[PDB]
Structure 1
Amino acid sequence: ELVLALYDYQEKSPDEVTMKKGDILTLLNSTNKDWWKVEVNDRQGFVPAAYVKKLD
């Protein structure tokens, strides 16, 4: 369940999390087609699904 951040994304609401391009994130929930829940270092939240790429 690893995904690569294709772009920077800065969180804009309570449920979101910030990532930087090239970060390797742990994918927690990909049930929604637009927003995926990931763990970015020590924080968890949503980012746009189109901005990350599954590695497996």
Structure 2
Amino acid sequence: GSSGSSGKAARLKFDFQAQSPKELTLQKGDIVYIHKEVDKNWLEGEHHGRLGIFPANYVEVLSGPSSG
């Protein structure tokens, strides 16, 4: 019932500006959830208020100090 682990959080390398209506506009230092993979350099994601797609280049899978 919506309990477990959706996916991995990714922080935007920098302020991204979506030129197309399909893309998504995000600012440097934001967290987005990836639902499914769109293209080799593209990914899908949904955000509270705005939903669409974004480039996988302006996003990188960060890691936590949880374990060395």
Deviation >4 Å, runs of 4+ = none
Higher RCO, Cα 8 Å, sep 6+: 1
Q: Which has the higher helix share?
A: 1
Pair 1:39 & 2:46 matched: yes
What runs of 5+ residues in structure 1 fail to find an aligned partner?
Answer: none
What runs of 5+ residues in structure 2 fail to find an aligned partner?
Answer: 1-6, 64-68
> For this pair of structures, how many residues does the alignment match?
56
CA RMSD, 1 decimal: 1.7
TM-score, normalisation: structure 2: 0.67
Percent of aligned positions with the same letter in both sequences? 36
TM-score, normalisation: structure 1: 0.77
